[PDB]
Design a protein around this motif. Sequence first.
Motif, mmCIF file in Angstrom:
data_model
loop_
_atom_site.group_PDB
_atom_site.id
_atom_site.type_symbol
_atom_site.label_atom_id
_atom_site.label_comp_id
_atom_site.label_asym_id
_atom_site.label_seq_id
_atom_site.Cartn_x
_atom_site.Cartn_y
_atom_site.Cartn_z
ATOM 1 N N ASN A 278 -8.215 5.152 1.816
ATOM 2 C CA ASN A 278 -7.947 4.758 0.470
ATOM 3 C C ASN A 278 -8.954 5.388 -0.440
ATOM 4 N N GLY A 279 -8.360 5.971 -1.760
ATOM 5 C CA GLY A 279 -9.320 6.566 -2.707
ATOM 6 C C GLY A 279 -8.364 7.225 -3.757
ATOM 7 N N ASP B 54 -1.244 -1.097 7.831
ATOM 8 C CA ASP B 54 -1.245 -2.356 7.093
ATOM 9 C C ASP B 54 0.224 -2.661 6.971
ATOM 10 N N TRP C 55 -6.571 9.736 -4.388
ATOM 11 C CA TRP C 55 -5.751 10.850 -3.767
ATOM 12 C C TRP C 55 -4.271 10.767 -4.391
ATOM 13 N N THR C 56 -4.198 10.834 -5.691
ATOM 14 C CA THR C 56 -2.842 10.617 -6.183
ATOM 15 C C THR C 56 -1.729 11.436 -5.575
ATOM 16 N N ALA D 250 8.849 8.304 3.044
ATOM 17 C CA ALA D 250 7.857 7.329 2.512
ATOM 18 C C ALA D 250 8.208 6.281 1.837
ATOM 19 N N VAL D 251 9.067 6.349 0.797
ATOM 20 C CA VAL D 251 9.651 5.279 -0.200
ATOM 21 C C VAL D 251 10.633 4.520 0.595
ATOM 22 N N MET E 128 -3.072 2.566 4.724
ATOM 23 C CA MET E 128 -1.401 1.955 4.301
ATOM 24 C C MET E 128 -0.543 1.700 5.356
ATOM 25 N N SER F 166 8.677 -0.069 -2.959
ATOM 26 C CA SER F 166 10.019 -1.269 -2.960
ATOM 27 C C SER F 166 9.207 -2.472 -3.028
ATOM 28 N N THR F 167 8.005 -2.678 -2.351
ATOM 29 C CA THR F 167 7.224 -3.877 -2.684
ATOM 30 C C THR F 167 7.060 -4.455 -3.876
ATOM 31 N N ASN G 291 -2.198 4.037 -12.930
ATOM 32 C CA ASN G 291 -2.060 4.814 -11.547
ATOM 33 C C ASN G 291 -3.007 4.324 -10.611
ATOM 34 N N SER H 176 1.445 3.624 -4.696
ATOM 35 C CA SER H 176 1.517 4.546 -3.745
ATOM 36 C C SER H 176 3.298 4.538 -3.234
ATOM 37 N N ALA H 177 3.565 5.554 -2.778
ATOM 38 C CA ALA H 177 5.032 5.797 -2.499
ATOM 39 C C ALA H 177 5.709 4.674 -1.314
ATOM 40 N N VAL H 178 4.734 4.345 -0.270
ATOM 41 C CA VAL H 178 5.315 3.423 0.530
ATOM 42 C C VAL H 178 5.137 2.019 0.043
ATOM 43 N N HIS H 179 4.682 1.765 -1.149
ATOM 44 C CA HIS H 179 4.569 0.510 -1.860
ATOM 45 C C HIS H 179 5.709 0.118 -2.991
ATOM 46 N N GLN I 84 3.970 8.371 -8.036
ATOM 47 C CA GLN I 84 2.721 9.229 -8.324
ATOM 48 C C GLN I 84 3.072 10.695 -8.185
ATOM 49 N N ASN I 85 4.147 11.190 -7.479
ATOM 50 C CA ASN I 85 4.363 12.410 -7.452
ATOM 51 C C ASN I 85 5.922 12.483 -6.886
ATOM 52 N N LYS J 29 -3.084 5.596 -7.528
ATOM 53 C CA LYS J 29 -3.607 6.512 -6.594
ATOM 54 C C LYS J 29 -3.313 5.984 -5.213
ATOM 55 N N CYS J 30 -4.218 6.393 -4.215
ATOM 56 C CA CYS J 30 -3.898 5.875 -3.051
ATOM 57 C C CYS J 30 -4.687 4.728 -2.398
ATOM 58 N N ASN J 31 -4.188 3.546 -3.080
ATOM 59 C CA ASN J 31 -4.871 2.388 -3.050
ATOM 60 C C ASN J 31 -4.056 1.018 -2.767
ATOM 61 N N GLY J 32 -4.513 0.007 -2.139
ATOM 62 C CA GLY J 32 -3.683 -1.086 -1.938
ATOM 63 C C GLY J 32 -3.324 -1.394 -0.679
ATOM 64 N N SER J 33 -2.823 -2.560 -0.398
ATOM 65 C CA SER J 33 -2.163 -3.104 0.883
ATOM 66 C C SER J 33 -1.014 -3.837 0.385
ATOM 67 N N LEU J 34 0.025 -4.250 1.200
ATOM 68 C CA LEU J 34 1.008 -4.986 0.827
ATOM 69 C C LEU J 34 0.693 -6.078 0.062
ATOM 70 N N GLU K 274 -0.807 10.989 -2.419
ATOM 71 C CA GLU K 274 -0.969 10.768 -0.817
ATOM 72 C C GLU K 274 -1.047 9.302 -0.248
#
Lengths: 255, 255
Positions: free
Chosen positions: B71-72, B85, B74-75, B44-45, B82, A48-49, A10, A43-46, A64-65, A12-17, B77
Amino acid sequence: PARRPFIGGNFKCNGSLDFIKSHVAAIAAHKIPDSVDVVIAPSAVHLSTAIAANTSKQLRIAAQNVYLEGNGAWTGETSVEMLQDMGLKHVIVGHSERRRIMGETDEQSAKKAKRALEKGMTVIFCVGETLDERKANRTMEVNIAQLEALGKELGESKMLWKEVVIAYEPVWSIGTGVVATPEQAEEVHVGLRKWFVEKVAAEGAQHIRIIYGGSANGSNCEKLGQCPNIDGFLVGGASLKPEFMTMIDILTKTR
Amino acid sequence: PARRPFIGGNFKCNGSLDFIKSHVAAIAAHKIPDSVDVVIAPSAVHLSTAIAANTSKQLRIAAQNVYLEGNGAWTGETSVEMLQDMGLKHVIVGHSERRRIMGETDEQSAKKAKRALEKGMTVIFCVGETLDERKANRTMEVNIAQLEALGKELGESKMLWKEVVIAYEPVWSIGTGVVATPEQAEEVHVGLRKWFVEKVAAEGAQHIRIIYGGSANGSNCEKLGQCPNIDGFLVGGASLKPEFMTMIDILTKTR
């Protein structure tokens, strides 16, 4: 009567493209046996990447949710349909951060899981007690209550339990570095097996995977993985590092 | 002392990868003047997919929600970091569906907006009263309270109001087809202008965009757009259809 090992990462809320591309690439480049389920949840926005960067035949991507409604007027929420349309089959539900920090109730987590399960997805259903609840000697009561809410939603439709992977993560072990000892963890997984046997089915308790999460890493996962009722791990911080691949190897060699 | 028109299209929890690609392509293929801000907010996705499909120099992509932490752990979220970025500069905050259905409090919405604003993003801050609150003659009290929570977080840092686009969407008009009449809408926007003048700055009230949302579509947006205090629209269902492009034209020709 045993099980197919399982390890989930998991992010979680971490990462860049760039982090997602590189990290997923590094994980995908690792040899992953067909004998163990390996899933990572960016994370959701990531999503596809991550999918684009996942060149592995074994590695699977998860969310994640997910919301408890289908497509509709739910601003900011993601539907099961969206995840499946993207080719995803795994999703984390009820993570304690959402339960404890964001107000996700036992029933909401249960309803999210049920909807995901009914549509064919595999759900990593998280449960866990806080430091105070454990101090109050309410560890099993709480974990069982969270599992019962799901039991209420699935109840009869037992078969749906087949795609459920229970993740026990004591809240006091989440992001604190205070991992549970093999005895503490195994003791709880034992209590969860017993609950499953009684409220679900003896047969099902023998097959459902129950993984441990909460400060699990490369140097402590082996002793945990050697416990009979610990089928794997739900890795948080360590899943963002190269040690995640080591954990995969350790899990494979252990069971 | 007027304003740059603004029209946003909130897709909400709708769409598949193919729909996003085609719909964004159709919108991007439409002539969009440099005189009006046009933003669409996919789930988001779908953000990456939308960005890839957006070949327009004017069309901008936005997120439907964002968390109030960086960032942290926060599953589930998404952080402002992000979104930035990914090259995104717009984000919807406090949509009534999240406020009324998901429990997002006035303060949480306010804190999310403040964090986004401090980092340089433009925020579409939603406010609106329910049918019962209006029936109780509490329309302005509620809308002002929601705006005040934001005022408390920004308060002094007035300048941050520059990147705020207020979206008034009476809850009884959301997804019901029961759009507000030009008089009802203008009356509320007038009350919001007055609040801004008093609690923020006379100068700022003259510049901040206040858009109307809630059952806004191609056949009723012209009369609404002709109202002095209605700078545009936050489009829900209609943003998923070809009429969204018509609304863009109507908004342009009107103001």
